[PDB]
C-alpha cells in the first residue's frame, strides 16, 4: 500500500500533464497562425503588436517548460522504487507482489520513453519559436506551422502504452 499510492499518483499525473500539454499547444498554434498572417500582411504591402505576440508565445513556452520539469520529477521518483525494492528484496525474490503481473522495470521503460519524446519535442518547439518571425519564404512558414501542429517526435504507440498503465492502475474500470 506504500508503493500503491505513489503508482496511482503518477498515473494521474501523467494523464493530466498530457492534457495540459495539448491545451497549451492549441493556444500556441492560434498565436503562431496570427503572427504568420501579420508578417505576410506586411510583406504583401507594428513592432508593438509583433513584440506582444512574441511575448505571449514565450509565455506559452515557459508554461511548457514547467510541464517538462514536472515530467523530470516523475521519472526520478519511479527510478527509486526500482533500486530500493530490487536491492532489499535482493534476489531470492523472483516473486515481486505488484498489482497484477508487472515488475517495476516496465514502469521505468514507459516513463523513460515518454520523457525522451517530450524532451525532444520541446527543443523542436524552441527552434520554431526562434526562427518563425524572421523568415520570408512561405514554404518554410508552412513547414514551421506543420511542425507545430503535427508534432513529429511523438509516437502514437506510446499513447497506447499509457493506456497499459491505466489498465495497470485501476482508475479506469476493467
Amino acid at each position: 500500500s506504500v508503493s500503491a499510492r505513489k503508482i496511482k499518483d503518477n498515473a494521474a499525473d501523467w494523464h493530466n500533464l498530457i492534457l495540459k500539454w495539448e491545451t497549451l499547444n492549441d493556444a500556441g498554434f492560434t498565436t503562431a497562425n496570427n503572427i504568420a498572417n501579420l508578417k505576410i500582411s506586411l510583406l504583401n504591402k507594428y513592432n508593438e503588436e509583433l513584440e506582444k505576440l512574441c511575448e505571449e508565445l514565450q509565455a506559452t513556452l515557459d508554461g511548457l517548460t514547467k510541464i517538462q520539469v514536472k515530467m523530470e520529477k516523475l521519472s526520478s521518483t519511479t527510478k527509486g522504487i526500482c533500486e530500493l525494492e530490487n536491492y532489499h528484496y535482493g534476489e531470492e525474490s523472483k516473486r515481486p507482489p505488484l498489482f497484477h503481473t508487472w515488475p517495476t522495470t516496465h514502469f521505468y521503460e514507459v516513463s523513460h520513453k515518454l520523457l525522451e519524446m517530450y524532451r525532444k519535442e520541446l527543443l523542436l518547439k524552441r527552434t520554431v519559436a526562434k526562427e518563425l518571425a524572421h523568415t520570408g519564404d512561405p514554404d518554410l512558414t508552412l513547414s514551421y506551422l506543420s511542425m507545430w501542429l503535427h508534432q513529429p517526435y511523438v509516437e502514437s504507440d506510446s499513447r497506447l502504452h499509457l493506456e497499459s498503465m491505466l489498465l495497470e492502475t485501476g482508475h479506469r474500470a476493467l
Binding site: E51, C54, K130, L132
Partner: peptide, 26 residues
C-alpha cells in the same frame, strides 16, 4: 546582457566602457 530581438535570444559580453567624465576601464 540579454535581449530578445523579435523572439530571438541574444547574449552579449561587456569588454570596455568609457563614460562622460573621461575614464576608460579595461
Amino acid at each position: 546582457l540579454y535581449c530578445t530581438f523579435y523572439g530571438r535570444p541574444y547574449k552579449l559580453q561587456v569588454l570596455r566602457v568609457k563614460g562622460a567624465d573621461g575614464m576608460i576601464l579595461g
